[PDB]
Design a protein around this ligand. Structure first.
Ligand SMILES: [Mg+2]
Ligand SMILES: [Mg+2]
Ligand SMILES: [Mg+2]
Ligand SMILES: [Mg+2]
Ligand SMILES: [Mg+2]
Ligand SMILES: [Mg+2]
Ligand SMILES: [Mg+2]
Ligand SMILES: [Mg+2]
Ligand SMILES: [Mg+2]
Ligand SMILES: [Mg+2]
Ligand SMILES: [Mg+2]
Ligand SMILES: [Mg+2]
Ligand SMILES: [Mg+2]
Ligand SMILES: [Mg+2]
Ligand SMILES: [Mg+2]
Lengths: 210, 202, 147, 51, 102
RNA sequence: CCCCGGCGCGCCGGGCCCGGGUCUUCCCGGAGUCGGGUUGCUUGGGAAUGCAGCCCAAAGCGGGUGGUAAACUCCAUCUAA
RNA sequence: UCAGUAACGGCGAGUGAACAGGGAAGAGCCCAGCGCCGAAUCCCCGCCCCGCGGCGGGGCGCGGGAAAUGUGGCGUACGGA
């Protein structure tokens, strides 16, 4: 029975919920399991980055988030072809590669190319044969000063270009923003019916001739 | 060549293929319900479904009676609320092809089911052919392209609904149509949606 | 703390705080929100008016991020930039106007409620309101749009 | 008794820090230490620091 | 004029320089080859036509086109598939005419 | 002090005779399946989310999806069986 | 987290997801088909030497089979030859 004044609250407890109860008493006993296997992994991959292969720079969909930048899954084969890295050898120097990604823009394609250059320049390569160096391989002076990098590799940080204070012109003060918004919204909500009404104005006013 | 038998087996409404499918269906209707075939009836569809013409690969032909699943209850009398008074027009949730693959995977329990296909039907029967693999031959043990099937994880793929015809019945997949099977399966989705996560600190 | 609760003073009294005439039975009104239209109508009308019925159009596949638009008012518009930008524009004499980028702070629309300090600004934002733009002209300033 | 009883409590960080600063500001008072029971009648100075 | 990018309107959106690439090889699928066409017609000439395309052809001979399209739509399903099946069922008919014409 | 294993380095007998870049000529796909009707169950999925039975039954610049049924025309998106 | 939300529902009781985003983890691939290659491939038995307690390595057999109703190598939608 409801009291005087309160909420109409619907509790979702009409199923046998006591059987399927999930308690988190092993959360501290699994955080240590994850950390232990994360340092067994950071010891299995000795000089390779501890976070893993480098990820590209990636905008987000969904206008809620389409101004932040993120770390994608891999570098599209287009960006690998521009950077000059075979798609089957990229995965062996810790470069991430997913083929599913497209590249519609260019401002991001060149950003990820510059990213591959900034990684293939920071890359210290060890020679396949230890007792014998090779051609494309960092020299032993690097290899002795080559450490294991912690955290993400080349971390991605949202930056904003600092624009200094200008002086406002009378063309900036002439710009009616709210009117321009309501006008573009009208000219877009009405574009189809306007074009059809003018196709009718041009399909009727021709009959008068023939 | 194989694409000629392929584009031919799509004109099932033609004359030649309605003569062949009908003499096949008549001959099948006279043999046993589950009998071993000497060789794959459709060699092209068999390759497409994974049949290498080498030792160890077996083809069983099996027929199943068409129609829905009458409810196994007394005369009428399904004691319950009028919602569940249905007996006649009910349907089974597993395809007749999965029932063929599991009557083969049960009649011959040593062999591992790979896939199956349709070779004929009539008003009272549907005829399938199941591609069974012998997982202890050496043509399959040593060949590393197919030694996955010999591990104990793939026991009774069709009793666990992992063949193609079975997977087609569990409504799994990626998309906005397959939301009720996010996670392992329908019951592993149901469990996580109907499971109350009670953290330590709430 | 049970030692603070009310069932520690209720030991020894027969009805345990619940009545001699009318007992504490299990569900003497039905379970949950039962009788919203029959015997709990005075309560569902005195306290939850409009709880019964339909209104408006449905929208099947609603996605809550197409309609994302967090707003910021003019009163706390000058709080998005540092203090040495508003006072630097005070001490400024070459008429330069600081550029306040709002979508960089996390708002799309600018509503104009508060007063403004008398100095020019260049407000970059996605959507503007009529009054929010008039309060900016009336102080001298530009309403830049950014798609 | 069930096992989903609320066993653990969470406290605001600024309040755990208020409590730490209040438990340190109270360890430099001869009365608040001689009243907890400690026998410090001959300690040369309360904030006892050593090399 | 002072035109700005706008979140709304007829050309809304942040402005990027749209690059071009070779279209994915996936989209290529479905297109006929000069060999798969030869197999399709070389089996059309072996099998023939369906018992309902033998009827659609006789309905397109007397030029009862609306009924001959409602028949195909009822018999095969979607209107797009019916229209696309009728177009070829009339191209083959003009072939069986430009054949025995001489 | 015993045993197991890994990570290691030599040696033998084997393998394997191998890559990328630019042009040129070529080739490229999974059917009683998709799909439509209808029936039953299921789903938040509402002019059918999914599945299944029965009937019809494909195409290949095609096919599916783009959360309201239908026709027209554009585009996005993958490439099922 | 979205979310007790969109939606379902004698639109009553009640039921009720997904997208995006932040995290743990992080890895891809393989066929049929289409072609190219003297079937270039596989299993089994007999004998030699070793290895031998997870039944293998190498050599011989005008030894037997499977397989042209298609074995092996290249190759699979990110194109490939
Ligand atoms: Mg009361
Ligand atoms: Mg699997
Ligand atoms: Mg299907
Ligand atoms: Mg009393
Ligand atoms: Mg009593
Ligand atoms: Mg009381
Ligand atoms: Mg009472
Ligand atoms: Mg009570
Ligand atoms: Mg009444
Ligand atoms: Mg049921
Ligand atoms: Mg239900
Ligand atoms: Mg997401
Ligand atoms: Mg992580
Ligand atoms: Mg292969
Ligand atoms: Mg082959």
């Amino acid at each position: 029975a409801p009291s005087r004044n309160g909420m109409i609250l619907k509790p979702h407890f009409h199923k046998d919920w006591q059987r399927r109860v999930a308690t988190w008493f092993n959360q501290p006993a699994r955080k240590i399991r994850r950390r232990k296997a994360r340092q067994a992994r950071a010891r299995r991959i000795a000089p390779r980055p501890a976070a893993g292969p480098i990820r590209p720079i990636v905008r987000c969909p969904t206008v809620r988030y389409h101004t932040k930048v993120r770390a994608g899954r891999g570098f599209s084969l287009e960006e690998l072809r521009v950077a000059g890295i075979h798609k089957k050898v990229a995965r062996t120097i810790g470069i991430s590669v997913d083929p599913r990604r497209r590249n519609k823009s260019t401002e991001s394609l060149q950003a990820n190319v510059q990213r591959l250059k900034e990684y293939r320049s920071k890359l210290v390569l060890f020679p396949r044969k230890p007792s014998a160096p090779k051609k494309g391989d960092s020299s032993a002076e690097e290899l002795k000063l080559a450490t294991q990098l912690t955290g993400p590799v080349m971390p991605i940080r949202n930056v904003f270009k600092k624009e200094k204070a200008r002086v406002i012109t009378e063309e900036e003060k002439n710009f009616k923003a709210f009117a321009s918004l309501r006008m573009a919204r009208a000219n877009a909500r009405l574009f189809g019916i306007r074009a059809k009404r003018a196709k009718e104005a041009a399909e009727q006013d021709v009959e008068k001739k023939k | 060549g194989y694409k000629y038998i392929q584009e031919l087996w799509r004109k099932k409404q033609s004359d030649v293929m309605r003569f062949l499918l009908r003499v096949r269906c008549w001959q099948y209707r006279q043999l046993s319900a589950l009998h071993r075939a000497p060789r794959p009836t459709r060699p092209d569809k068999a390759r497409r479904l994974g049949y290498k013409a080498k030792q160890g690969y077996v083809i069983y032909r099996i027929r199943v009676r068409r129609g829905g699943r009458k409810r196994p209850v007394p005369k009428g009398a399904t004691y319950g609320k009028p919602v569940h008074h249905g007996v006649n027009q009910l349907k089974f949730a597993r395809s007749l092809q999965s029932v063929a693959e599991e009557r083969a995977g049960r009649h011959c329990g040593a062999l591992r089911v790979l896939n199956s296909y349709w070779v004929g039907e009539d008003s009272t029967y549907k005829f399938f052919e199941v591609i069974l693999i012998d997982p202890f031959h050496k043509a399959i043990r040593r060949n590393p392209d197919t030694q996955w099937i010999t591990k104990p994880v793939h026991k009774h793929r069709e009793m666990r609904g992992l063949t193609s015809a079975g997977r087609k019945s569990r409504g799994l997949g990626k998309g906005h149509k397959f939301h009720h099977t996010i996670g392992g399966s329908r019951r592993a989705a149901w469990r996580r949606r109907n499971t109350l996560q009670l953290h330590r600190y709430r | 703390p049970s030692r603070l609760r009310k069932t520690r003073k209720l030991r020894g009294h027969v009805s345990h705080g619940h009545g001699r005439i009318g007992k504490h039975r299990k569900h003497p009104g039905g379970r949950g929100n039962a009788g919203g239209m029959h015997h709990h109508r005075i309560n569902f009308d005195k306290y939850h008016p409009g709880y019964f019925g339909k209104v408006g159009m449905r929208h099947y596949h609603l996605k809550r991020n197409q309609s994302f638009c967090p707003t910021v008012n003019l009163d706390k518009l000058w709080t998005l930039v540092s203090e040495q930008t508003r006072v630097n524009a005070a001490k400024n004499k070459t008429g330069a106007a600081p550029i306040i980028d709002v979508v960089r702070s996390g708002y799309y629309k600018v509503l104009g409620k508060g007063k403004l300090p008398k100095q020019p600004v260049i407000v970059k934002a996605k959507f503007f309101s009529r009054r929010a733009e008039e309060k900016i002209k009336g102080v001298g300033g530009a309403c830049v749009l950014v798609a | 008794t069930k096992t989903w009883r609320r066993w653990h409590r969470r406290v605001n960080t600024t309040q755990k820090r208020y409590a730490i600063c209040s438990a340190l500001a109270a360890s430099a008072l001869p009365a608040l230490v001689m009243s907890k029971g400690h026998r410090i009648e001959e300690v040369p100075e309360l904030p006892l620091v050593v090399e | 004029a002072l035109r700005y990018p706008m979140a709304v309107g007829l050309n809304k959106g942040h402005k990027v320089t749209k690059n071009v690439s070779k279209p994915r090889h996936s989209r290529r699928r479905g297109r006929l080859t000069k060999h798969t066409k030869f197999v399709r017609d070389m089996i059309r000439e072996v099998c023939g036509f369906a018992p309902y395309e033998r009827r659609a052809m006789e309905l397109l001979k007397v030029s009862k086109d609306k009924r001959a399209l409602k028949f195909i739509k009822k018999r095969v399903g979607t209107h797009i598939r019916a229209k696309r099946k009728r177009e070829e069922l009339s191209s083959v008919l003009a072939a069986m005419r430009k054949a025995a014409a001489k």
